Amino acid sequence: ANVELQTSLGKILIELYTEHAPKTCQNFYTLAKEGYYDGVIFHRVIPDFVIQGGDPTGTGRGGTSIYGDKFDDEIHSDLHHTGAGILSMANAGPNTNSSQFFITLAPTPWLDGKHTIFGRVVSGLSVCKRMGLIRTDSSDRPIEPLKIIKAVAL
């Protein structure tokens, strides 16, 4: 399991934790296979917290998984947000995971609860460190569109 993200700032590579959480990673894998992540804006960027994105609407809402609306999150003990670069999922309830995800920029130990951890960024962390310095308006949203040109899975 391995996905490249051709982002505007640079190149992002992710290795999926299929052995830990298989159900929540296969959707991302086949989703990059389908590749509607083309032209998807990283609508949320917070200095030292996250970079969220993945909704075709671009309005900070929406996003359809392969199951279609949502699914069940699986979390176990050894998973932690101890670093900066853990690739996790975005939800709005108990089991409300959608197609959109986010990348961690600082240890968020308080967040190892309702959020599924299914990735680690091996290469391109400098791209995320630069994304942490992107011009952002009053709300947590970049002023210029931070589109993903392509997402090729390998």
Partner: peptide, 21 residues
């Protein structure tokens, strides 16, 4: 860490495979 946007966003790899913009 509080640096905020003190500089222009670094040039983007455009969708036309242009390495830098």
């Amino acid at each position: 860490r509080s640096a905020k946007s003190a500089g222009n966003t670094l040039a983007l790899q455009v969708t036309s495979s242009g390495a830098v913009d």
